[PDB]
Amino acid sequence: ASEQSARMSAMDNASTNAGEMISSLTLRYNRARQAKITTELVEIISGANAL
């Protein structure tokens, strides 16, 4: 019984940590998305203005 109680508690803590990590990775993902967009766009513009 003690094992099962501790298992439930561990599942709670793991889900919480997973939510936190998902938040952080979502922030990083959006940052890298914007960075990729800006980089590709600057590449295109410099290749269009380098003629």
Binding site: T26, N30, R31, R33, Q34, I37, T38, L41, I45
Partner: protein, 367 residues
Amino acid sequence: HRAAPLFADQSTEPGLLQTGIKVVDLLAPYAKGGKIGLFGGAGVGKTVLIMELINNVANKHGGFSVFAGVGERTREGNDLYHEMMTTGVIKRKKLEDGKFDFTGSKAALVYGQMNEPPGARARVALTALSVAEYFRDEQGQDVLLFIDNIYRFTQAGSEVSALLGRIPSAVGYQPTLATDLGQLQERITTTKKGSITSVQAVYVPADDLTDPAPATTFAHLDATTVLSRQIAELGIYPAVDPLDSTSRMLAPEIVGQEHYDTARATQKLLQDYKSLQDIIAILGMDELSEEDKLVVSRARKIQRFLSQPFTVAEVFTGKPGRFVELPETIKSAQTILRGECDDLPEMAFYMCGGLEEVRSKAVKMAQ
């Protein structure tokens, strides 16, 4: 294209806007000369929220309103026009010769259609804004201005900048983004003659609140009003999420330090009930203490008290409209949180607009 109000012609006294909605006037109080975000699509009761705000502000504040459609769907425009003609927001009475008589209405409409090129979708908000500044300046009124989406303004600006050959900024947006948004949004404010409130609908691309469009809009927004289908599926209307909603006017200086206390108490109650729901989903509602069941009861009771009918939905439902002042809402929330009305039943709160009607409904449902 009109210059914004100067520094001398601007009101330093902020003041709320008496809408007539309970959750709004309690937990996300609007302001005069303010700008309110409205995060929500369809299936939530947004058109009906719009018509109710229009009707109540026209009845009480005597003010007119404006609706701007920035690159909207044409069938959606047709639907909105016919819904207004049904709900009485517009009065289009035929005449004998064959002309029309647009008698006493409560809203003008300015539409820049999707089939229109960029430049119209960019100068439509300015058209509606001048139409509203006419009422503000000369007539001396407190008017409204609804905007179907503020992201399409930015789309059109970016397009126009690409056509004109301007080097795009970080994520393709134009380099005149904040400048143009300020040229727009600095005319929506209070003056010594009247005021223009505004309700802008916002679309966060890819759930990125850091995108420069919403990052520049939230600086101008004095409030926020989120909708959800997970509260409309409960039958609650308006489906305003009292937690996700925010405001800069909820502080205990504009509203006194009783509005603030009631609002924070209700938010605490609803967070506790959310956690209790997440628990009851697993452990069942038998493992709850008496104080926990009291919290659950009060939370469901206030979540169903905040719902109310609409004068415009009368024609769709038959149930008439109920105006609810803010002191009345505050007293009702005080009593519900004090635990006085815990002897009432659940469904008396639902679709009711005050404790008088709730107790009457309970008296009649006892039979």
